Symmetry: D2
């Protein structure tokens, strides 16, 4: 679970490669996505929310018009678990659908 | 307003080349999109329904899992229109992002 | 799996009881729901979607503006399982929120 | 376009009843919501998006699992515009139904 140094290192990169940062202050990983419009920003949030239940691992996000900032980090192990590694991979896999 | 043939005949094809088409019993173009999973078929519907609402033009649709069949017309025209038309173009895009 | 006698006789009674009719041709239950607008008809569709994907059991729905028509049967059974039934009512409990 | 003194006094109150609050800093009301679960909250987030779409006046929101926090200001106005005053109001027409 609660990412080991050992793990967390090797999982983190690709995420790291795309904008996903570690948060100073908590064991979390954030990222803001800036779409082209609302229809997209929300088309995005949807497939993602359709997928946060599927897993029963929900994000911390915030949309305005076309930017959403997503913060991931497990409540169960008060940390970054593989759980959100997955979810983020999926999150990424979705934005790419959107422009 | 209701498409003439000069109209139908400029407008049409472009969508037709794509897979859209008149119904035999009535003035309306069908098309049935088919994705990879439910999640994608729904994100696609979320994207058109935001759109629908916006420009107040709705589809008669039908989804199962990952299949979604869309049929357009304009109700106060008893037939095709510019609306139907703008709509398929849209839906057409959104759809091209799901593959 | 394929809901049997008392089972049905005990379970189905309740749904018919709320307009859940029975399908002529398949082993399925169906329902059509009139909403006041699309703003509803879709805010519902979505909350049911979120669930059809939480339990991996999807509806067959058709939607025009405010109407929604739901057919439910498990095809792995090819017929009325539980699946329908406990989804039938989640889906009922939804329609109450808006209708 | 911007909400005079009068306007607020008539306009702003009732909203103020049910929870709406004006923040200090830029001109804008605010309102944390909390629902049973994420179905319920996204179910509500959608009807609300369908509308900010129909009307082109989008909220500024944050969603955790079931907690949803809204903030409405009007870019031009650099404060409350009649748009905001009613989007809150729809946003309540939505809310209650959920519970």
């Amino acid at each position: 679970h609660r990412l080991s140094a050992e793990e967390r290192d090797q999982l983190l990169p690709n995420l790291r490669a795309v904008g996903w940062n570690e948060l100073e202050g908590r064991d979390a990983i954030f990222k803001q996505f800036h779409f082209k419009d609302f229809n997209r920003a929300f088309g995005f949030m949807t497939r993602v929310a359709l997928q946060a239940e599927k897993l029963d691992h929900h994000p911390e996000w915030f949309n305005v018009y076309n930017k959403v900032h997503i913060t991931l980090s497990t409540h169960e192990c008060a940390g970054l678990s593989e759980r959100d590694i997955n979810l983020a991979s999926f999150i990424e896999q979705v934005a790419v659908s959107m422009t």
